[PDB]
Ligand binder design. Structure first.
Ligand SMILES: OC[C@H]1O[C@@H](O[C@H]2[C@H](O)[C@@H](O)[C@H](O[C@H]3[C@H](O)[C@@H](O)[C@H](O[C@H]4[C@H](O)[C@@H](O)[C@H](O)O[C@@H]4CO)O[C@@H]3CO)O[C@@H]2CO)[C@H](O)[C@@H](O)[C@@H]1O
Ligand SMILES: [Zn+2]
Length: 472
């Protein structure tokens, strides 16, 4: 049938199903309600940076419409909602003065979610560093971010933690490091060539290191001050796309494993084992920061669960590892991504050029984490696909490809869980069509259609698929 034998009975007892948004992508009221600017506000308001010079000033206006959106997610039989708190909406300058109107918004949101029986899963950070912190401290280049983030996290735990029991610190630090500091295509637009300055060979590693230290510090604060009373959990969200060896050659198998290590091992080896992957230590050498023993012990075991954002897969082709002059994090891997095997593409692309529809990548990623890292508790924190711009409403609603996407990816996830993977939940990116970073409003990831002229919500076929699949 159209569910393909999927239902709540097909997953573990108490398995959590949710949808996901992030603050800047959906909230709107970017310069209102006392919110201070983030690095994304400054970036998106610069001509040329975003498709059509668009920005998140209004976005989906969830700020005003949150009760409509919560009613909708409940009507679709979800158990949970992953959203993020905008740091600069709480602390307009990133430190010091609290914006009480901002606090009130998140209180109202959290309270309504709970009233409607939806569990809040709350991200502290989703790319939206307060602009004041970027200017004053140099953002994630500065080790002082650990202190600054911890104080912000402390406030959130104190203010919301009696109700919020499921936290995440960061979202995809790999992408911040890569796009913000290697390629320089996301704020702060740093890179070797870039006008803002930077160094693609060193800064991504500094930034990743500071994310890990900041995460660890915030979790240490949670555990020592709040956890006894609040009895919640704190994790982190990491992107992981699957890498499959192009052939069974030694070089190609090594390349696939090297890619896994530079992609997910970069964060998981510190979080699980207390060190960076050996291959990164060997290849990146002096450009890879060293944890002190005390720091490594703070970082190891500091995630109660691992959020994995899983979208896609590629093949990897290898070659002889060679001595080379350092140029970038990306070039450090010494691999070649390949998107076809035996003359056939790995999968068709969704609207985003990077997003190949490869359901077996979900199995690959989950099974790999199970086998490599001692089967830690995993939550699939994002999974989804996008439609292009300029379709009619009815074309958006008839999202047959997305229905197929979810049925196939969830079937592969089920396969991994049935084989013993410790997966505790699954969250669809996204509840709503939203502001998709560089793509602005030209990329539509929602299971619910948003008319960006009127702001009206209309559930797509995929929303009704979930409703049918998830009926209690
Ligand atoms: O976009 C939807 C949603 O997803 C979350 O973030 C997305 C980013 O928006 C997107 O830019 C990012 O793109 C990745 C892509 O997934 C990777 O497959 C690719 O990986 C490279 C690797 O870096 C290379 O070194 C290697 O050689 O090749 C591989 C494969 O080509 O890199 C690109 C970036 O350049 O994907 C993210 C998810 O993975 C956000 O959380 C959410 O807010 C977004 O709305
Ligand atoms: Zn409004």
């Amino acid at each position: 049938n159209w569910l393909g034998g999927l239902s709540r009975a097909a997953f573990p007892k108490r398995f959590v199903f949710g949808t996901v948004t992030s603050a800047y992508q959906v909230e709107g009221m970017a310069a209102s309600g006392g919110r201070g600017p983030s690095i994304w506000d400054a970036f998106a308001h610069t001509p040329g940076n975003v498709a059509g010079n668009q920005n998140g000033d209004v976005a989906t206006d969830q700020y005003h419409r949150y009760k409509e959106d919560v009613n909708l997610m409940k009507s679709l039989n979800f158990d949970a909602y992953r959203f993020s708190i905008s740091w600069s909406r709480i602390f307009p300058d990133g430190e010091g003065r609290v914006n009480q109107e901002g606090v009130a918004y998140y209180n109202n949101l959290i309270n309504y979610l709970l009233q409607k029986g939806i569990t809040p899963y709350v991200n502290l950070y989703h790319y939206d560093l307060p602009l004041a912190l970027e200017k004053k401290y140099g953002g994630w280049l500065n080790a002082k971010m650990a202190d600054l983030f911890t104080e912000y996290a402390d406030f959130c735990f104190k203010t919301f933690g009696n109700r919020v029991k499921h936290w995440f610190t960061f979202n995809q630090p790999r992408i911040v490091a890569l796009l913000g500091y290697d390629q320089g295509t996301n704020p702060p637009k740093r890179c070797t060539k870039c006008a803002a300055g930077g160094n693609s060979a060193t800064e991504p590693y500094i930034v990743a290191h500071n994310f890990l230290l900041s995460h660890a510090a915030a979790v240490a604060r949670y555990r020592t001050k709040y956890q006894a009373a609040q009895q919640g959990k704190v994790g982190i969200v990491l992107d992981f796309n699957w890498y499959e060896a192009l052939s069974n050659s030694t070089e190609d198998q090594a390349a696939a494993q090297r890619a896994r290590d530079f992609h997910i091992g970069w964060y998981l080896d510190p979080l699980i084992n207390g060190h960076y992957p050996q291959i990164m230590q060997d290849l990146v050498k002096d450009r890879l920061p060293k944890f002190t023993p005390e720091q490594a012990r703070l970082v190891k075991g500091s995630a109660d669960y691992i959020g994995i954002n899983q979208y896609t897969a590629s093949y990897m082709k290898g070659q002889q590892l060679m001595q080379q002059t350092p140029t970038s994090y990306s070039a450090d891997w010494q691999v070649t991504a390949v998107f076809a095997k035996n003359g056939k593409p790995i999968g068709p692309q969704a609207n985003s050029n990077w997003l190949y529809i490869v359901p077996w990548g979900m199995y690959g990623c989950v099974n790999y984490i199970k086998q490599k890292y001692g089967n830690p508790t995993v939550v699939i924190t994002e999974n989804g696909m996008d439609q292009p711009a300029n379709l009619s409403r009815d074309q958006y609603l008839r999202d047959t490809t997305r229905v197929h996407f979810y049925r196939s990816y969830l079937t592969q996830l089920k396969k991994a869980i049935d084989e013993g993977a410790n997966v505790a939940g699954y969250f669809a990116w996204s509840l709503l069509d939203n502001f998709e970073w560089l793509s602005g409003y030209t990329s539509k990831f929602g299971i619910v259609y948003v008319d960006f002229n009127t702001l009206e919500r209309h559930p797509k076929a995929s929303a009704y698929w979930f409703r049918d699949m998830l009926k209690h």
